[PDB]
Nucleic acid binder design. Sequence first.
RNA 1: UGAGCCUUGAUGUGUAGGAUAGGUGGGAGGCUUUGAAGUGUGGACGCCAGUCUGCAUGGAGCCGACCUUGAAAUACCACC
RNA 2: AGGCGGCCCCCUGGACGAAGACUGACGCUCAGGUGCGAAAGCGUGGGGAGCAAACAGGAUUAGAUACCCUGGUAGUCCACGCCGUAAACGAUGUCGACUUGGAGGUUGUGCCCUUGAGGCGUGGCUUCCGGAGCUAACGCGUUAAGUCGACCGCCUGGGGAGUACGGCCGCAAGGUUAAAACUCAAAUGAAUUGACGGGGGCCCGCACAAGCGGUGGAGCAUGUGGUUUAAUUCGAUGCAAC
RNA 3: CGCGGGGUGGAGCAGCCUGGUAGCUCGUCGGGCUCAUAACCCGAAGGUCGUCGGUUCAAAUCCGGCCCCCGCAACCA
Lengths: 117, 56, 151
Amino acid sequence: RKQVSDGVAHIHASFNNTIVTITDRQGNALGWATAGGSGFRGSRKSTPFAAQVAAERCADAVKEYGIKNLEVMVKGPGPGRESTIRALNAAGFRITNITDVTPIPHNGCRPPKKRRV
Amino acid sequence: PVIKVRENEPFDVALRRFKRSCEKAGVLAEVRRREFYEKPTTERKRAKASAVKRHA
Amino acid sequence: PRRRVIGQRKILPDPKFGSELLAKFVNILMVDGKKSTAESIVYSALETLAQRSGKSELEAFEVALENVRPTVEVKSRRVGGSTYQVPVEVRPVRRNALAMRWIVEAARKRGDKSMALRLANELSDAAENKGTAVKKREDVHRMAEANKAFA
RNA sequence: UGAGCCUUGAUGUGUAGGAUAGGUGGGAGGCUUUGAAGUGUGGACGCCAGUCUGCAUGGAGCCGACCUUGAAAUACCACC
RNA sequence: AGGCGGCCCCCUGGACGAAGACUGACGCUCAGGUGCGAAAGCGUGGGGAGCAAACAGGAUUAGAUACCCUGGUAGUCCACGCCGUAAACGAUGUCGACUUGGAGGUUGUGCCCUUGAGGCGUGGCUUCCGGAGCUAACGCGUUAAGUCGACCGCCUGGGGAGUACGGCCGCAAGGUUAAAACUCAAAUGAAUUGACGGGGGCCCGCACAAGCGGUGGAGCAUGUGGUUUAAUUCGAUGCAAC
RNA sequence: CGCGGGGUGGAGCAGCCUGGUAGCUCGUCGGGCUCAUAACCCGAAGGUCGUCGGUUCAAAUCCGGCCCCCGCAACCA
Ligand SMILES: [Mg+2]
Ligand SMILES: [Mg+2]
Ligand SMILES: [Mg+2]
Ligand SMILES: [Mg+2]
Ligand SMILES: [Mg+2]
Ligand SMILES: [Mg+2]
Ligand SMILES: [Mg+2]
Ligand SMILES: [Mg+2]
Ligand SMILES: [Mg+2]
Ligand SMILES: [Mg+2]
Ligand SMILES: [Mg+2]
């Protein structure tokens, strides 16, 4: 049902949690998986291996939709920056676009203050 | 850094290229800079320090 | 040592078969220095396993060890306040030793009437993967697996 | 895009086991040119065993108590 | 000066320079006086995304009115005003003059055939190292803290106290000017040897790790302490007394 | 009293939803681990599955009475 040949794969690589989300060419989701939603908390949450695992899980989930070719959207810097992509490659999706959509502000919005440790 | 995969090219190589592109951009560094707000004074001080370091 | 990396002392093989591993096992078993008793116990254990399995005394020893030895072992790093118990690749030299130690511990724990008999039983359990040492190995592996995340 | 229903097609692994046996009554043969074995398979389900077909190819056979089972043929079936 | 960074237009200040032309001391500083003056704040009116005092909850914590997280009002933004303080700091008043230098950078400009980005030199502007010199040294150092001149401003031990009281200014917050009594023998400044750092780098020890056995729990030996005794000889007291 | 849903390890919730089937959140102890309370895993004790009978090979799972908790509207001399 509602099968697709190729779709976008958003990886939200952050300092806290890596998010893997597989969506349509235009922007309609099918299945997502998170490193925190794989059975990992705190120190295990922000991890390349965990990210990889999450990616694998996502791939497993989306295999019902008949996806063959793949494109990946990269958002933010995290521990799972390339590990995630490696995972999906291993899972067997013929990667075409390694898109980077990192949210760099052009000096507008005020950031929060420094963490004094 | 929007990166496309060429024909007759491995995945690892593509990944490496992407990494290089990222490095060239300095996106991660920018994010780090913007992670927490910097007071202008502090930034200026840092710049001065960097300049000092440059002189060897 | 902070400075010294030295080649370890030569340990002579077992009198009955010709095995360094067996000797090492005996040493591990032995405390206070009573080697001849320990050796005898080991021999007895081997005999019972042979009587049970109907196989070679050393080969059986080996596969039991194989069944109880892990590939990955956790190690504390202590960088922050929270535990950073990083898993590390274990060398084939000390892995064996660790397995032997585990076996010994299991034997100690066991409540059969002869110590030789106890360890024979442990060996048997290892062969059929159901004993205490094997269980310990399993969770060690699980612990490593959980935190294999770190490098 | 939900609600039923006259209706017509799917659906039923306790382990014994030919393997995805719901039961209760009529039967030892029903089906076939309102086209039988075997072959490429689309889509499904799925216990991954296999289970229901759509369409093409092929043109004269698959099944039945079987050995099993607390229950027997999906050899024909109605009440559902 | 405070400051000011998307872009584009309008209005406009100033600087700097090059050839030249002209005025002819028109110069300098500045008590009082006037204007400008980050931030926060204050005032009406707006505007309000984020951020974020206060504030709330969570943690953390011995406690946690904090640091940390989630949130979140004033404020941060404009409009015309007030405020008039900042470590407004080059901690160096302002101007003018002179004295071996370099590496540069920045911003121009004029000749020589630019015979090529370039070359000759040669003027303005800013940064670092540093000679003479100077200083308490640190250091500053043709942008002086050097050698002189002018002119001001301000200091005269610390604290009390840049506070009181009074004035003047302020819507208010307060600002400004500015004491005294009493009190202390120091108060500092630079640098030096040290030590120390929950600074940095190096190395090392059974220091950790990895391991092997303990003690600590029991009884016994012993020694101390504590209590007790007529007397419990006295000393030993982190390691380095038991 | 009429009707509807529930009695599930120490507690609550899935398994009923059309027989072939004890899982979830903790709680408790032990082990590993940390300076650790904790976080985290491994292992275990802990349930006439309201009660009882019936159909059946097979029920906590279908039904019947009975008991308890709740919800429901209802009148209440
Ligand atoms: Mg004249
Ligand atoms: Mg302001
Ligand atoms: Mg205001
Ligand atoms: Mg905050
Ligand atoms: Mg609080
Ligand atoms: Mg002042
Ligand atoms: Mg300033
Ligand atoms: Mg001053
Ligand atoms: Mg200098
Ligand atoms: Mg005052
Ligand atoms: Mg003791």
